[PDB]
Write a protein that holds these residues in place. Sequence first.
Motif, short mmCIF file in Angstrom:
data_model
loop_
_atom_site.label_atom_id
_atom_site.label_comp_id
_atom_site.label_asym_id
_atom_site.label_seq_id
_atom_site.Cartn_x
_atom_site.Cartn_y
_atom_site.Cartn_z
N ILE B 67 -7.61 -8.94 85.24
CA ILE B 67 -9.04 -8.99 84.99
C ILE B 67 -9.36 -10.20 84.13
O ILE B 67 -10.27 -10.95 84.44
N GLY B 68 -8.57 -10.43 83.08
CA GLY B 68 -8.78 -11.61 82.28
C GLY B 68 -8.56 -12.87 83.08
O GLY B 68 -9.28 -13.88 82.90
N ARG B 69 -7.55 -12.87 83.95
CA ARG B 69 -7.31 -14.09 84.75
C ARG B 69 -8.51 -14.46 85.65
O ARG B 69 -8.86 -15.66 85.79
N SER B 70 -9.15 -13.44 86.21
CA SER B 70 -10.23 -13.69 87.15
C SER B 70 -11.42 -14.17 86.36
O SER B 70 -11.99 -15.23 86.67
N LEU B 71 -11.73 -13.43 85.28
CA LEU B 71 -12.79 -13.78 84.37
C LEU B 71 -12.68 -15.21 83.92
O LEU B 71 -13.68 -15.90 83.84
N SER B 72 -11.49 -15.64 83.61
CA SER B 72 -11.29 -16.96 83.06
C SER B 72 -11.58 -18.05 84.05
O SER B 72 -11.46 -19.24 83.69
N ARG B 73 -11.95 -17.69 85.27
CA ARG B 73 -12.07 -18.73 86.31
C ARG B 73 -13.52 -18.90 86.74
O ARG B 73 -13.84 -19.76 87.56
N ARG B 74 -14.36 -18.03 86.19
CA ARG B 74 -15.78 -18.10 86.34
C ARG B 74 -16.29 -19.38 85.62
O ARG B 74 -15.55 -20.03 84.84
N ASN B 75 -17.51 -19.80 85.94
CA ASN B 75 -18.04 -20.96 85.26
C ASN B 75 -18.47 -20.56 83.84
O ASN B 75 -19.08 -19.53 83.64
N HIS B 76 -18.11 -21.34 82.85
CA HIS B 76 -18.31 -20.84 81.50
C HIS B 76 -19.62 -21.37 80.97
O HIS B 76 -19.76 -22.56 80.73
N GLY B 77 -20.59 -20.49 80.84
CA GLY B 77 -21.95 -20.91 80.58
C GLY B 77 -22.22 -21.10 79.11
O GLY B 77 -21.31 -21.09 78.28
N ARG B 78 -23.48 -21.22 78.81
CA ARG B 78 -23.97 -21.65 77.55
C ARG B 78 -23.85 -20.46 76.61
O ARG B 78 -23.46 -20.64 75.46
N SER B 79 -24.14 -19.25 77.09
CA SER B 79 -24.02 -18.08 76.24
C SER B 79 -22.71 -17.33 76.56
O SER B 79 -22.43 -17.08 77.75
N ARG B 80 -21.91 -16.95 75.53
CA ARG B 80 -20.48 -16.60 75.77
C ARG B 80 -20.09 -15.36 75.05
O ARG B 80 -20.75 -14.96 74.12
N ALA B 81 -19.09 -14.66 75.54
CA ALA B 81 -18.57 -13.49 74.84
C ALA B 81 -17.16 -13.26 75.28
O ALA B 81 -16.78 -13.67 76.39
N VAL B 82 -16.35 -12.71 74.38
CA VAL B 82 -14.93 -12.44 74.66
C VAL B 82 -14.68 -11.14 74.00
O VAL B 82 -15.09 -10.95 72.85
N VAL B 83 -14.12 -10.22 74.77
CA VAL B 83 -13.67 -8.97 74.21
C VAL B 83 -12.16 -9.11 74.19
O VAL B 83 -11.58 -9.55 75.18
N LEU B 84 -11.53 -8.83 73.05
CA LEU B 84 -10.11 -8.98 72.95
C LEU B 84 -9.58 -7.56 73.03
O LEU B 84 -9.93 -6.75 72.17
N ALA B 85 -8.77 -7.25 74.05
CA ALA B 85 -8.34 -5.86 74.27
C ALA B 85 -6.89 -5.76 74.65
O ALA B 85 -6.35 -6.70 75.27
N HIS B 86 -6.29 -4.61 74.27
CA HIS B 86 -4.91 -4.25 74.62
C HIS B 86 -4.85 -3.29 75.79
O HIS B 86 -3.80 -3.20 76.38
N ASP B 87 -5.93 -2.58 76.10
CA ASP B 87 -5.92 -1.62 77.20
C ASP B 87 -7.31 -1.47 77.82
O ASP B 87 -8.24 -2.16 77.42
N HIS B 88 -7.45 -0.57 78.79
CA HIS B 88 -8.78 -0.39 79.43
C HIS B 88 -9.83 0.19 78.56
O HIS B 88 -10.98 -0.30 78.56
N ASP B 89 -9.47 1.20 77.79
CA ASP B 89 -10.44 1.79 76.83
C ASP B 89 -11.05 0.80 75.83
O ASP B 89 -12.27 0.80 75.58
N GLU B 90 -10.17 -0.01 75.24
CA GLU B 90 -10.60 -1.00 74.28
C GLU B 90 -11.60 -1.90 74.99
O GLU B 90 -12.72 -2.11 74.50
N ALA B 91 -11.20 -2.38 76.18
CA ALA B 91 -11.95 -3.35 76.96
C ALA B 91 -13.35 -2.86 77.26
O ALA B 91 -14.33 -3.57 77.04
N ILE B 92 -13.45 -1.61 77.68
CA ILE B 92 -14.71 -1.05 78.05
C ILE B 92 -15.61 -0.93 76.80
O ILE B 92 -16.80 -1.32 76.85
N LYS B 93 -15.06 -0.43 75.70
CA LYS B 93 -15.85 -0.18 74.50
C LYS B 93 -16.40 -1.53 73.99
O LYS B 93 -17.59 -1.65 73.72
#
Lengths: 9, 465
Positions: B67-93
């Motif tokens: 999921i991170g790999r795919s996300l990282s290939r999107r065009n990176h726009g002006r407004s940005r956010a990164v969720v740093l996660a170890h698992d699915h639960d963390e990621a979703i929250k």
Amino acid sequence: KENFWGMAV
Amino acid sequence: PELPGVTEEALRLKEAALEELAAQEVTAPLVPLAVSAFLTSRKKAAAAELADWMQSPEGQASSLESIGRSLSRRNHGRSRAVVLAHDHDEAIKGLRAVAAGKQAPNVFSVDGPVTTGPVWVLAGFGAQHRKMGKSLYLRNEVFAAWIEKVDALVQDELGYSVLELILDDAQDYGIETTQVTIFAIQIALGELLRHHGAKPAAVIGQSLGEAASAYFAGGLSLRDATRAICSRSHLMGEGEAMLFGEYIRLMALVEYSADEIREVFSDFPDLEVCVYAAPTQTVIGGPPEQVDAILARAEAEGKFARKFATKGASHTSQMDPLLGELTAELQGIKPTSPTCGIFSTVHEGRYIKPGGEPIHDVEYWKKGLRHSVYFTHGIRNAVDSGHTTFLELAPNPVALMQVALTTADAGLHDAQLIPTLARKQDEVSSMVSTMAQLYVYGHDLDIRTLFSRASGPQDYANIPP
């Protein structure tokens, strides 16, 4: 106390 | 000119440490999930939509890394956010909070990029710890190579292996090796950042760090910057070892400002200022009886004060007898015109611009070792000139707490204070999270490089477009 992911606190 | 290879003992130590690493329980890595758009409103939508997908069985079946790999290939726009996660639960929250524009420790989110480049902070005093750099050395091929490169230069300059120190948990650091090793680690951490596309807009140095700062500002080759830290470091160790008892100068931090110090010092005629560290914090140095006295005068007045334990007396008269050997050792270094900005805490905090005249002279290192470090002044000068992102390259982030004291005093109440490694924090994670922050604020950082090349398609996710 700067935390887990780079946070001054 | 053939450079020494990694030593036998270093190879032996490495093998042992790898064996022990291979036996610990593997912990889930920290994955950074980038989400962006031209508009904050749309960034939140994508967030909530990605989260909704990650809830579904298909999304639950896909690895975070994909999921991170795919996300990282999107065009990176002006407004940005990164969720740093170890698992699915963390990621979703985390994504829930990005969407709700609420805050959390594992989330970073901005409306748009920071205007000015990052200032890379190169310090080191008080940042050492026993296992510093080891874990990243074992786990990260790009770090390891740079460590090994400095390790070769120091063997050549000084005759021992810094990498052996790093690998050997039984080995502790002293006046000399603490410095050459924090340097190794500063160099390698900066180059790891360069490898991922980061660059400093400017450097600022603090005592030991000044030689790494020179290197990253293009002011000296790696060789000559190693030469500068090697001469400082070994001369300081030798000079203390030959002095005994109450002739050893001590250093301490006290909660007095530059102005308060000129007054306070009239009682302590041998005290000197080592580092103007913060607007109301100064590291001072001199004879122990005067150090203890100023300490007690502070503790009495209701002011913070902590004595350091190192018989280093950088920036005191205890450096007087080394200046000549120092001058002699660094004959031949070649100062070059810098390639990024420099706040010179040696020159009273003054800015030198990319393209400026070389300032990495032998006399510069002589000046820097003997005289006061104008750190707070340098940081104030950065803030006043529009810089708001401060990234410390350190095995532990002590100078960013000092940076915060200056940013706040100058009216900058929301600076981006970015640490690198830290004691008690997984070093691979730390770097991930430092790179995420750079990315988020719009600074150079090719976030695609935070994932290995896909081999097959299960290395991607079906992320909602």
